[PDB]
Design a protein around this ligand. Structure first.
Ligand SMILES: O=C(O)C1=C[C@@H](O)[C@@H](O)[C@H](O)C1
Ligand SMILES: [Cl-]
Length: 175
């Protein structure tokens, strides 16, 4: 079972944090969005467009359940997986790290490299805020470790997690 399952919104640093955490632990990194494409040979968008949302979610849940069973390292969950009741059920009992950010912080961090993100109009930021209002309550439900990542360097976030994922040395009996 995974050392840590990472959840959060775009802008939470989830990709970078996952890689860095896996590097520090020396464990494998499995991203469920990548795994779905590797197992189907179809892009995320293609699946949505042809089989529909519900079928994408069923495929994703199968992938997530298999990873929870078989993967020992860091598991990075796609951003909509927790909308599936079966995924929230399957997570119970796992170590689930929620990289928590505010709506304002998320909007800032998903603006990209343009200097004047406001000039493109409010629609993208409004859709982001809507997404956070829907997703954040579900991430708080499934979390076992909430980590405030607002204005923190990704290395500090990794240290915070590592200090709360320590494993004692085994006894003689265990060895
Ligand atoms: O927010 C979502 O529901 C999604 C997030 C991505 O990680 C992908 O799993 C896909 O684009 C759906
Ligand atoms: Cl690091």
């Amino acid at each position: 079972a995974p050392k840590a399952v990472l959840v959060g919104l775009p802008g939470s640093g989830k990709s970078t944090i996952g890689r860095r955490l896996a590097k520090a632990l020396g464990v494998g990194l499995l991203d469920t969005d990548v795994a779905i494409e590797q197992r189907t040979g179809r892009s995320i968008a293609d699946i949505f467009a042809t089989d529909g949302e519900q079928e994408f979610r069923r495929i994703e849940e199968d992938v997530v359940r298999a990873a929870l069973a078989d993967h020992d390292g860091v598991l990075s969950l796609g951003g909509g997986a927790v909308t599936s009741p079966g995924v929230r059920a399957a997570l119970a009992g796992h170590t689930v790290v929620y990289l928590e950010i505010s709506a304002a912080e998320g909007v800032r961090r998903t603006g990209g490299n343009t200097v004047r993100p406001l000039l493109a109009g409010p629609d993208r930021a409004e859709k982001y805020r809507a997404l956070m209002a829907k997703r954040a309550p579900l991430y708080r439900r499934v979390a076992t470790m909430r980590v405030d990542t607002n204005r923190r360097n990704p290395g500090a976030v990794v240290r915070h997690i590592l200090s709360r994922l320590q494993v004692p040395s085994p006894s003689e009996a265990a060895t």
